Ligand binder design. Sequence first.
Ligand SMILES: NC(=O)C1=CN([C@@H]2O[C@H](COP(=O)(O)OP(=O)(O)OC[C@H]3O[C@@H](n4cnc5c(N)ncnc54)[C@H](O)[C@@H]3O)[C@@H](O)[C@H]2O)C=CC1
Ligand SMILES: NC(=O)C1=CN([C@@H]2O[C@H](COP(=O)(O)OP(=O)(O)OC[C@H]3O[C@@H](n4cnc5c(N)ncnc54)[C@H](O)[C@@H]3O)[C@@H](O)[C@H]2O)C=CC1
Ligand SMILES: NC(=O)C1=CN([C@@H]2O[C@H](COP(=O)(O)OP(=O)(O)OC[C@H]3O[C@@H](n4cnc5c(N)ncnc54)[C@H](O)[C@@H]3O)[C@@H](O)[C@H]2O)C=CC1
Ligand SMILES: NC(=O)C1=CN([C@@H]2O[C@H](COP(=O)(O)OP(=O)(O)OC[C@H]3O[C@@H](n4cnc5c(N)ncnc54)[C@H](O)[C@@H]3O)[C@@H](O)[C@H]2O)C=CC1
Ligand SMILES: O=C(O)C1(C(=O)O)CC1
Ligand SMILES: O=C(O)C1(C(=O)O)CC1
Ligand SMILES: O=C(O)C1(C(=O)O)CC1
Ligand SMILES: O=C(O)C1(C(=O)O)CC1
Ligand SMILES: [Mg+2]
Ligand SMILES: [Mg+2]
Ligand SMILES: [Mg+2]
Ligand SMILES: [Mg+2]
Ligand SMILES: [Mg+2]
Ligand SMILES: [Mg+2]
Ligand SMILES: [Mg+2]
Ligand SMILES: [Mg+2]
Lengths: 328, 328, 328, 328
Amino acid sequence: DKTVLDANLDPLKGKTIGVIGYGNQGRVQATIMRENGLNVIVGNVKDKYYELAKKEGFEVYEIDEAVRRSDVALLLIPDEVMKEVYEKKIAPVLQGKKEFVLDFASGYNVAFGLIRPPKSVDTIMVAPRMVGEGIMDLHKQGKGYPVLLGVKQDASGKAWDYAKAIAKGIGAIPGGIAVISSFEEEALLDLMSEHTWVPILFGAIKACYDIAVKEYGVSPEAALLEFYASGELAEIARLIAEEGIFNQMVHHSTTSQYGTLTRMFKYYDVVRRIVENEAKYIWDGSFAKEWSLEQQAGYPVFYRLWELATQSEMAKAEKELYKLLGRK
Amino acid sequence: DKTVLDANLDPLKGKTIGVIGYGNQGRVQATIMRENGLNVIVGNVKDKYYELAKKEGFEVYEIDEAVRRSDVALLLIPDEVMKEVYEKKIAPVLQGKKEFVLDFASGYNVAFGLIRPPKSVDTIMVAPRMVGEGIMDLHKQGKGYPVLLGVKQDASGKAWDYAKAIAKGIGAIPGGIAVISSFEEEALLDLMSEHTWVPILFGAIKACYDIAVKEYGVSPEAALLEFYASGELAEIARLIAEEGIFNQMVHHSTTSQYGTLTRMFKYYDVVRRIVENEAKYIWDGSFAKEWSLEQQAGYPVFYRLWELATQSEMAKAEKELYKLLGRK
Amino acid sequence: DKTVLDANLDPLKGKTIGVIGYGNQGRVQATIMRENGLNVIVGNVKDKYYELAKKEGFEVYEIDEAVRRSDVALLLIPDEVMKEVYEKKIAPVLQGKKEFVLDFASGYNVAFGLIRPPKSVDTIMVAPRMVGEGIMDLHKQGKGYPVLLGVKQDASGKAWDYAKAIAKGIGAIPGGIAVISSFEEEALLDLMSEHTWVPILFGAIKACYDIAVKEYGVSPEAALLEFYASGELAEIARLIAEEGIFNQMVHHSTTSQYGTLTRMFKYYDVVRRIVENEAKYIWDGSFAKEWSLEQQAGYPVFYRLWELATQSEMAKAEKELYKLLGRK
Amino acid sequence: DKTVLDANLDPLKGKTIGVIGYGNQGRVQATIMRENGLNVIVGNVKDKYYELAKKEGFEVYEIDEAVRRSDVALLLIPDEVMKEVYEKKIAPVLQGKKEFVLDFASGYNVAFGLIRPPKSVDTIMVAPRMVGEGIMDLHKQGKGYPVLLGVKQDASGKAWDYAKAIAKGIGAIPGGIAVISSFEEEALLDLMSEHTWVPILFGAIKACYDIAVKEYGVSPEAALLEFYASGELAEIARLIAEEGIFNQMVHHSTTSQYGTLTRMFKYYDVVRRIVENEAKYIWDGSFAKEWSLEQQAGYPVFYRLWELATQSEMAKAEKELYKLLGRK
Ligand SMILES: NC(=O)C1=CN([C@@H]2O[C@H](COP(=O)(O)OP(=O)(O)OC[C@H]3O[C@@H](n4cnc5c(N)ncnc54)[C@H](O)[C@@H]3O)[C@@H](O)[C@H]2O)C=CC1
Ligand SMILES: NC(=O)C1=CN([C@@H]2O[C@H](COP(=O)(O)OP(=O)(O)OC[C@H]3O[C@@H](n4cnc5c(N)ncnc54)[C@H](O)[C@@H]3O)[C@@H](O)[C@H]2O)C=CC1
Ligand SMILES: NC(=O)C1=CN([C@@H]2O[C@H](COP(=O)(O)OP(=O)(O)OC[C@H]3O[C@@H](n4cnc5c(N)ncnc54)[C@H](O)[C@@H]3O)[C@@H](O)[C@H]2O)C=CC1
Ligand SMILES: NC(=O)C1=CN([C@@H]2O[C@H](COP(=O)(O)OP(=O)(O)OC[C@H]3O[C@@H](n4cnc5c(N)ncnc54)[C@H](O)[C@@H]3O)[C@@H](O)[C@H]2O)C=CC1
Ligand SMILES: O=C(O)C1(C(=O)O)CC1
Ligand SMILES: O=C(O)C1(C(=O)O)CC1
Ligand SMILES: O=C(O)C1(C(=O)O)CC1
Ligand SMILES: O=C(O)C1(C(=O)O)CC1
Ligand SMILES: [Mg+2]
Ligand SMILES: [Mg+2]
Ligand SMILES: [Mg+2]
Ligand SMILES: [Mg+2]
Ligand SMILES: [Mg+2]
Ligand SMILES: [Mg+2]
Ligand SMILES: [Mg+2]
Ligand SMILES: [Mg+2]
């Protein structure tokens, strides 16, 4: 199928590579590649992470300097401010180039047009789905991890093979896999999760707490223990990742199975409508507007919601309890 | 009535005039006026259009220089960025003046307060309704064209006569006509069209295509031919402009007349509600906010909708077909 | 694909052809075919058009006489009364035949069963999409035009090749194209347009006028100029036919693009429902009933709506204005 | 105001007049005019009414003969079939004329386009509002009655003075009055009554009977006596015509006044909506279609409703009762 289990490493050997950032990915992928036999460099804001980068033995010039030396550059930095940084300190230098290849971790800025490099640059993506520490927790096992391949602009007829070259350049295949997919799909997917089932889950838990306490005279401690203060969810998620989402439930009681299945098929349409609405809202570009403007305004809503969440009854009770159990 | 069929040319003879821009209008109106016996100048961004402007024999200083020399200035440039340009490079110079007269092509920026010149400047508008090439396609015929007159600020008791002086200074009357109307009316009108019947028309066509193909098993080619790939609409519009909208239909079949009339009077209320909503949305200033913010954010929605429109089935089919017919 | 770019001319050479009518199509297609090397005749009501037909050098017997001489006949006459004329003056003669081929310009009467010739006649259609003058405006250019091919009844196993023979017999391919499609598709398409986007467009324009005048104190002249009294729509339609519907908008302002796209995607569902309703109403045969009965009753609704449209405020204002501009 | 209290009689003296029909109006108006000093004739179907017409001393040729002799003709015949009769036996003769003037009693057929005489005939209306016997019940009193003047087509610049000449030619002014009004207004008005308050009244009475009998155990006799079997309504209507609709109520009890006024102002909106709907239905021409088709089909609905009304309980009870009181 569309999957790729391993591929070549030719087009990157003989060229220099530009690594922008030394955070989670930057450090991991950079060290991996250096250990994969390639000449590489680093670009970074000269701060604590720069200390750590030059510590681990990576020559780190300024950003634009690392782009002048490299014919490839990977922008392993945030998604909320990258626009300005590209406008000022990268776009000029890039205009001073021919045959360049720019690859990102997230498609937010490109899928929505906030960054439009010239037609003189093959534009690509790949993105893994971990938080990043799992990838060393797998590399020391000699394993490989899964990722999502994308190409935005092709000015060399080689963007795809460059894609797989990079892929193998970071230690994903062989050992994991590599999927191919537009910038658009990656962004859509990453945002659907953050907008559909995570918040629904959290709101459901909060509602259960509130109800159980204010309408059935229950002790906060017991509610917290049942819903999330226990590690039940973690084990369930592990079993899901191992065996499968449904086959996981064989280790439960028949009562749990029955209730879960019935109520799942009973409420499927509601959440379906919700997911439709949110996915549409994303496909159109509305959420990117919303979020960019919330930055420009000074993050008021962010602030207020962070406050309301922590000043809620559930959070205070969780505080007292976690204190009791010694949990920090 | 409020119309004016021709008027004087006195207050502009003896004065210098400031022409900002050499695009469609700028070039046409400027050449017309030079050919109407007036001393004029040009202000322009020094680029290809500046090449063409100095080509056609118009001394072109910098913007602010052309405003220092002139006691009148006309801002024949876009509507999305004009704000900043006025703030930086025009407002200072203007503060260095007394007795100035500023006229625009569109009232967007003034009707909504994005540009508020001092009380030391008679502020006016006029705007034609063509795309611009029709006006030479009429001037070489010695004809005149119609326009909309507006006055925002009067500090000389002469703004209206300056208005008609300008009017005749561009070759509209005699030969066409000149209407008088606020900045507000012009903006309201130009935006109602772009928000009510153009998009409704396009959506209706798209829906007809989709339905005919996915529910009645029709070939894309035939659908495209019927709906818009033919020049039927062009001839209809021409006859409308010539004879009248309804009298135009006498050249149709009685079947078409009957169906059209019945369905027109049948759906009038719906579109009426829609038009009410949109006109209200405009009168209040909401759309200007929406659009300015969409600029500040980086044009995400614009980008995504441009993509969705071109990646639609109808567009791909139109591509294949137009290729077949040799149409570029 | 289903398209055909040129084909044979064999089955019509050696046979006589029956041309019923000398209107727009009749004259054009008849002259074309005579100029394509075929023996042809004409059938016509002996009136001014008969004068013009015998003028241009076409022997014109009576209808039934032209059918007795020909083994093919094409009924290039209206769609509202053709039924009776076929019942009286054509059905008998046709019953006096074997091996006949009848082709029409519109499928209304056949797609809905108002005319059911015998199984002794291969029954076909083709229909172009112009108004008719464009076809000489193309033939003098040596070009060809597009059309829609259909076969209703096959009693010779040759109906399709007769179809393409006729096609080339009228100067469409080579130079244009020829699509194949049932009688049903042609009728459905021609009627969807006349019922969905034309009347919606007109009602939207009318509503905009009414609103702008009665709720924002606008002068009728300016409204008329903006909405349709200008030739803006004609140029837009031309660019659509030339470049494409969406690519056409690149010549507009970004403001117009943004508003149009947003409002198009915002109102797509409403017009979709409307189009569904009307297409269903047509597929079932209801509209044909409606229209036939409106004929039998004496055209009352037709009359009254024609009156209401012309006695509207917009029409009177358009009258005064068109008078001012010299437009007849 | 628009009223006219008396006028001239000149244009009709010296000309012959064509009177079509000898029914209620025909006889009355014809005898009046003969008694007003004018040369007149009659056209009639040769039947009992023809017997009566030639009885009263009016030479009566055939219809077309009476139109050949006259330069004016008045069509004092029904509204359901007049179309055909005009098509066959009047349109030809009329085509054989120049300078003709046709006046009707009702605008149904003309206001809706079922009869469109040539531009060689000044087309007019006037219509009285009685049933016809009241007009002799007034003429023997030397009085005059009110009527509604209308002009459809003017080919002599004299249609209005012909109108008033006719008016005085029938004994309406002086003594009554004459209003001027389109064909459209007359038809609209005559049909609104027959569709709004007459049927509402009857349905209300019927509902009151049904309710009182089936939910409060009342004797049919008493219900019939209260609601309509008494002549209460007749006296009320007389007082309305004499004094005024509201001033009429001073002769009632305060209880009746209070209840009537309160419930009138309480239900005004409902009946207003109903009247709006029906008036719209008429203005468009829909009802004329409905009624013409009900003729063409054979009057099924008419028949069935006539049956249901007479086979109702109320009608049978009214039968028994009217029998008791000797009323036929
Ligand atoms: N756990 C996560 O957050 C994951 C993040 N990603 C992607 O990697 C990127 C990193 O995300 P995070 O590190 O979590 O965000 P973060 O909030 O931790 O960003 C902190 C870093 O951004 C720099 N920075 C902050 N503001 C800056 C400014 N105005 N100008 C220049 N530099 C500035 C700082 O130097 C600092 O090193 C994101 O774009 C995301 O798309 C992908 C997988 C998981
Ligand atoms: N066909 C149309 O678009 C019509 C335009 N108008 C009015 O005339 C004006 C011109 O419209 P268009 O030429 O079509 O827009 P446009 O998109 O073609 O504007 C391009 C011009 O704007 C300049 N420009 C762009 N960005 C700039 C920036 N940041 N700073 C300085 N200059 C910048 C460029 O030098 C370029 O010459 C509009 O404001 C509109 O209200 C009136 C009738 C029709
Ligand atoms: N512009 C258009 O109206 C188009 C028409 N067509 C098709 O071609 C046909 C012609 O349409 P139009 O010429 O526009 O209609 P039309 O209203 O112009 O019809 C006038 C013609 O019909 C004849 N006619 C009228 N009543 C008649 C009657 N009772 N008995 C015998 N002959 C009568 C007349 O002699 C006259 O020549 C239509 O059926 C239509 O399907 C196809 C493309 C465009
Ligand atoms: N009381 C009323 O009905 C009112 C009538 N009018 C108007 O006066 C006219 C007379 O109305 P009515 O006498 O009540 O209608 P009606 O139902 O009494 O019509 C009977 C007359 O119509 C003739 N007739 C019937 N069918 C015919 C046919 N196929 N062909 C030729 N002649 C036919 C008959 O010979 C007969 O003389 C109407 O058109 C109406 O507009 C105006 C005021 C009141
Ligand atoms: O929620 C629980 O504790 C479980 C049960 O079956 O009772 C294991 C799922
Ligand atoms: O849509 C069509 O082709 C028309 C027809 O009457 O059939 C000309 C309007
Ligand atoms: O962008 C504008 O203002 C247009 C107008 O409606 O006049 C050209 C489309
Ligand atoms: O309905 C009645 O009998 C009346 C009353 O007042 O009781 C006279 C009106
Ligand atoms: Mg994710
Ligand atoms: Mg994310
Ligand atoms: Mg416009
Ligand atoms: Mg605009
Ligand atoms: Mg059509
Ligand atoms: Mg049609
Ligand atoms: Mg009446
Ligand atoms: Mg009546």
